[PDB]
Design an enzyme around this catalytic site. Structure first.
Site, PDB file in Angstrom:
ATOM      1  N   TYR B   8       0.848  -1.202   0.000  1.00 23.04           N
ATOM      2  CA  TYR B   8       0.000   0.000   0.000  1.00 23.04           C
ATOM      3  C   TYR B   8       0.882   1.251   0.000  1.00 23.04           C
ATOM      4  O   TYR B   8       2.110   1.148   0.023  1.00 23.04           O
ATOM      5  CB  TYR B   8      -0.924  -0.002   1.224  1.00 23.04           C
ATOM      6  CG  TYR B   8      -2.095   0.972   1.147  1.00 23.04           C
ATOM      7  CD1 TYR B   8      -3.023   0.902   0.111  1.00 23.04           C
ATOM      8  CD2 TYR B   8      -2.289   1.946   2.124  1.00 23.04           C
ATOM      9  CE1 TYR B   8      -4.094   1.785   0.048  1.00 23.04           C
ATOM     10  CE2 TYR B   8      -3.353   2.820   2.064  1.00 23.04           C
ATOM     11  CZ  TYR B   8      -4.247   2.749   1.020  1.00 23.04           C
ATOM     12  OH  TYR B   8      -5.313   3.614   0.965  1.00 23.04           O
ATOM     13  N   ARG B  14      -6.813   2.598   3.410  1.00 28.06           N
ATOM     14  CA  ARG B  14      -7.547   1.346   3.312  1.00 28.06           C
ATOM     15  C   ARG B  14      -6.772   0.121   3.774  1.00 28.06           C
ATOM     16  O   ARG B  14      -7.362  -0.958   3.893  1.00 28.06           O
ATOM     17  CB  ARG B  14      -7.990   1.106   1.864  1.00 28.06           C
ATOM     18  CG  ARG B  14      -8.982   2.131   1.342  1.00 28.06           C
ATOM     19  CD  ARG B  14      -9.329   1.825  -0.106  1.00 28.06           C
ATOM     20  NE  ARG B  14     -10.659   2.294  -0.494  1.00 28.06           N
ATOM     21  CZ  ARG B  14     -10.927   3.376  -1.222  1.00 28.06           C
ATOM     22  NH1 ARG B  14      -9.968   4.178  -1.674  1.00 28.06           N
ATOM     23  NH2 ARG B  14     -12.190   3.660  -1.502  1.00 28.06           N
ATOM     24  N   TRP B 102     -11.252  11.304  -2.810  1.00 23.00           N
ATOM     25  CA  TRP B 102      -9.861  11.333  -2.368  1.00 23.00           C
ATOM     26  C   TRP B 102      -8.925  11.675  -3.524  1.00 23.00           C
ATOM     27  O   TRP B 102      -7.960  12.418  -3.341  1.00 23.00           O
ATOM     28  CB  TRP B 102      -9.456   9.994  -1.743  1.00 23.00           C
ATOM     29  CG  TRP B 102     -10.326   9.585  -0.596  1.00 23.00           C
ATOM     30  CD1 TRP B 102     -11.306   8.642  -0.615  1.00 23.00           C
ATOM     31  CD2 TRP B 102     -10.299  10.112   0.738  1.00 23.00           C
ATOM     32  NE1 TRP B 102     -11.889   8.540   0.619  1.00 23.00           N
ATOM     33  CE2 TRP B 102     -11.295   9.433   1.471  1.00 23.00           C
ATOM     34  CE3 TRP B 102      -9.535  11.091   1.383  1.00 23.00           C
ATOM     35  CZ2 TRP B 102     -11.550   9.699   2.820  1.00 23.00           C
ATOM     36  CZ3 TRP B 102      -9.784  11.355   2.724  1.00 23.00           C
ATOM     37  CH2 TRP B 102     -10.788  10.662   3.428  1.00 23.00           C
TER      38      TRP B 102
HETATM   39  O1  LIG Z   1      -5.910  10.122   0.291  1.00 14.76           O
HETATM   40  C1  LIG Z   1      -6.203   8.967   0.046  1.00 14.76           C
HETATM   41  N1  LIG Z   1      -5.723   8.343  -1.031  1.00 14.76           N
HETATM   42  C2  LIG Z   1      -4.837   8.877  -2.060  1.00 14.76           C
HETATM   43  C3  LIG Z   1      -3.434   8.634  -1.504  1.00 14.76           C
HETATM   44  N2  LIG Z   1      -2.479   9.216  -2.439  1.00 14.76           N
HETATM   45  C4  LIG Z   1      -1.787   8.342  -3.377  1.00 14.76           C
HETATM   46  C5  LIG Z   1      -0.686   9.170  -4.035  1.00 14.76           C
HETATM   47  O2  LIG Z   1       0.039   9.873  -3.024  1.00 14.76           O
HETATM   48  C6  LIG Z   1      -0.724  10.902  -2.381  1.00 14.76           C
HETATM   49  C7  LIG Z   1      -2.236  10.661  -2.422  1.00 14.76           C
HETATM   50  C8  LIG Z   1      -7.083   8.218   1.004  1.00 14.76           C
HETATM   51  C9  LIG Z   1      -7.557   6.960   0.651  1.00 14.76           C
HETATM   52  C10 LIG Z   1      -8.345   6.259   1.544  1.00 14.76           C
HETATM   53  C11 LIG Z   1      -8.705   6.797   2.784  1.00 14.76           C
HETATM   54  C12 LIG Z   1      -9.524   5.949   3.689  1.00 14.76           C
HETATM   55  N3  LIG Z   1      -9.100   5.859   4.977  1.00 14.76           N
HETATM   56  C13 LIG Z   1      -9.720   5.074   5.875  1.00 14.76           C
HETATM   57  C14 LIG Z   1     -10.830   4.333   5.502  1.00 14.76           C
HETATM   58  C15 LIG Z   1     -11.292   4.400   4.200  1.00 14.76           C
HETATM   59  C16 LIG Z   1     -12.402   3.649   3.840  1.00 14.76           C
HETATM   60  C17 LIG Z   1     -12.887   3.703   2.545  1.00 14.76           C
HETATM   61  C18 LIG Z   1     -12.265   4.503   1.607  1.00 14.76           C
HETATM   62  C19 LIG Z   1     -11.147   5.252   1.956  1.00 14.76           C
HETATM   63  C20 LIG Z   1     -10.645   5.217   3.262  1.00 14.76           C
HETATM   64  C21 LIG Z   1      -8.201   8.033   3.159  1.00 14.76           C
HETATM   65  C22 LIG Z   1      -7.405   8.748   2.262  1.00 14.76           C
HETATM   66  N1  LIG Z   2     -12.581  -0.948  -2.456  1.00 12.82           N
HETATM   67  C1  LIG Z   2     -11.164  -1.080  -2.767  1.00 12.82           C
HETATM   68  C2  LIG Z   2     -10.632   0.265  -3.272  1.00 12.82           C
HETATM   69  C3  LIG Z   2      -9.135   0.301  -3.591  1.00 12.82           C
HETATM   70  C4  LIG Z   2      -8.737   1.615  -4.256  1.00 12.82           C
HETATM   71  O1  LIG Z   2      -9.523   2.250  -4.963  1.00 12.82           O
HETATM   72  N2  LIG Z   2      -7.492   2.026  -4.005  1.00 12.82           N
HETATM   73  C5  LIG Z   2      -6.911   3.238  -4.566  1.00 12.82           C
HETATM   74  C6  LIG Z   2      -5.825   3.781  -3.638  1.00 12.82           C
HETATM   75  S1  LIG Z   2      -6.377   4.571  -2.270  1.00 12.82           S
HETATM   76  O2  LIG Z   2      -6.806   3.446  -1.193  1.00 12.82           O
HETATM   77  O3  LIG Z   2      -5.159   5.443  -1.666  1.00 12.82           O
HETATM   78  C7  LIG Z   2      -6.248   2.855  -5.855  1.00 12.82           C
HETATM   79  O4  LIG Z   2      -5.511   1.876  -5.878  1.00 12.82           O
HETATM   80  N3  LIG Z   2      -6.508   3.607  -6.917  1.00 12.82           N
HETATM   81  C8  LIG Z   2      -5.966   3.431  -8.261  1.00 12.82           C
HETATM   82  C9  LIG Z   2      -4.756   4.319  -8.479  1.00 12.82           C
HETATM   83  O5  LIG Z   2      -4.374   5.107  -7.580  1.00 12.82           O
HETATM   84  O6  LIG Z   2      -4.157   4.234  -9.572  1.00 12.82           O
HETATM   85  C10 LIG Z   2     -10.457  -1.565  -1.531  1.00 12.82           C
HETATM   86  O7  LIG Z   2     -10.953  -1.296  -0.408  1.00 12.82           O
HETATM   87  O8  LIG Z   2      -9.422  -2.254  -1.673  1.00 12.82           O
END
Ligand SMILES: O=C(NCCN1CCOCC1)c1ccc(-c2nccc3ccccc23)cc1
Ligand SMILES: N[C@@H](CCC(=O)N[C@@H](CS(=O)O)C(=O)NCC(=O)O)C(=O)O
Ligand SMILES: O=C(NCCN1CCOCC1)c1ccc(-c2nccc3ccccc23)cc1
Ligand SMILES: N[C@@H](CCC(=O)N[C@@H](CS(=O)O)C(=O)NCC(=O)O)C(=O)O
Ligand SMILES: [Mg+2]
Lengths: 194, 195
Positions: B8, B14, B102
């Site tokens: 991750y 997640r 996000w």
């Molecule tokens: O900010 C989030 N994701 C993008 C991360 N980045 C990838 C590239 O580098 C910088 C940005 C993010 C994703 C997921 C969650 C999240 N946290 C706890 C629980 C969650 C449950 C469902 C969906 C999302 C959840 C919070 C923040």
């Molecule tokens: N319901 C699934 C969602 C995974 C997801 O969308 N992940 C995002 C990253 S995020 O959790 O920071 C992801 O992999 N997005 C595609 C990308 O960033 O290219 C789970 O819970 O595993």
């Protein structure tokens, strides 16, 4: 147990539960509505399933519960994980659509983006995942196969050419639709768009 | 006892539910926090993270993975019906958290503000009601739904410090989860990230 399913008059998120009851030959009440009922629900959402006076919610939590210890579950714990993973991947994508959006231009832009950009990638991934195998997980049908057929049916309404490059995914749909109990439900169920 | 490699981003996100489960069950795993993403993404059956490699076999979907790891453990739910309740609470939480854009500024800021201000308090009310004065969200002991509640609410609190000001019982539940020895140990040791 006495089962009462409550949802709208449509396939939507309830249909996976309806396929499962049909396949397992479980009698239930298919209660179709129709602001008042929303205030009674545990988290204000449908479907709900009442099981001898106990109220369950979340369509996939319910689906998984009904398939526990049945032939629709994965045959091993790792297969069960793959079943769960495919279902959430499908559910994730379907949940991206703004079904309840009132602004028609916003709705049309979002549906189009998802169907023309996102969907083809997912179809490609599902097809490669399936490969030349009979069903999505293991050697027999699971409720993941049901959910594929259910979700793709609705997607095809909006993008008829969705599976033109994926005959193996079409074959899988047809195999699900050919299961006698499922075929019978498909022919008798209310005909709704979604 | 298999070889586990969790992949991750360097964040709770997640993957954190899986990290709590490994901690509670005292399972050794490689916590692989990834410039590297394009290559890794291209090798994954569905192009998303987290994934969990189990003796080299790639599993995906954070909650499918969490459920797998908790099968036959005291985190699963004590009956088939409790297991349904656990799954339902987890999906209700995941649904809400997944509404946030996000990966989407301006439109992103607006949607966060709407969700946190107009929707989050409603969900907190429903969760408190569901908890119904009981010690844990399902049954008589901790489940991975309690873990997920604590994880999701921790992230919501980053954006909305007053989230639980009307829900002392939800604060109490968070603290109870945080005090479970394995969880407390992980919380103090984990990398400190915003999200
Ligand atoms: O900010 C989030 N994701 C993008 C991360 N980045 C990838 C590239 O580098 C910088 C940005 C993010 C994703 C997921 C969650 C999240 N946290 C706890 C629980 C969650 C449950 C469902 C969906 C999302 C959840 C919070 C923040
Ligand atoms: N319901 C699934 C969602 C995974 C997801 O969308 N992940 C995002 C990253 S995020 O959790 O920071 C992801 O992999 N997005 C595609 C990308 O960033 O290219 C789970 O819970 O595993
Ligand atoms: O159209 C949908 N929802 C709006 C319901 N309404 C009832 C009548 O008055 C107001 C509008 C809808 C909901 C759900 C899905 C759906 N179908 C299959 C699978 C799905 C999986 C996830 C999320 C949605 C899914 C398709 C359409
Ligand atoms: N992940 C949950 C979502 C249920 C849901 O949001 N249902 C919609 C109705 S329809 O779009 O299926 C809902 O309850 N919307 C709010 C409302 O209509 O008041 C599940 O699968 O049960
Ligand atoms: Mg989900």
């Amino acid at each position: 147990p006495n089962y009462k399913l409550t949802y709208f008059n449509m396939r939507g998120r309830a249909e996976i539960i309806r396929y499962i009851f049909a396949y397992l030959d479980i009698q239930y009440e298919d209660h179709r509505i129709e602001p008042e009922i929303k205030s009674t629900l545990p988290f204000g959402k449908i479907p709900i399933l009442e099981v001898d006076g106990l109220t369950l919610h979340q369509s996939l939590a319910i689906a998984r519960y009904l398939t526990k210890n049945t032939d629709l579950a994965g045959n091993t714990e790792m297969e069960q994980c793959h079943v769960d993973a495919i279902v959430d991947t499908l559910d994730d994508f379907m949940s991206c659509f703004p079904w309840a959006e009132k602004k028609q231009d916003v709705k049309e832009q979002m549906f189009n983006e998802l169907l023309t950009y996102n969907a083809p990638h997912l179809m490609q991934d599902l097809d490669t995942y399936l490969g030349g195998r009979e069903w999505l997980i293991g050697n027999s049908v699971t409720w993941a196969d049901f959910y594929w057929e259910i979700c793709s049916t609705t997607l095809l309404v909006f993008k008829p050419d969705l599976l033109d490059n994926h005959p193996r995914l079409v074959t899988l749909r047809k195999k699900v639709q050919a299961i006698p109990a499922v075929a019978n439900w498909i022919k008798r169920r209310p005909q709704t768009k979604l």
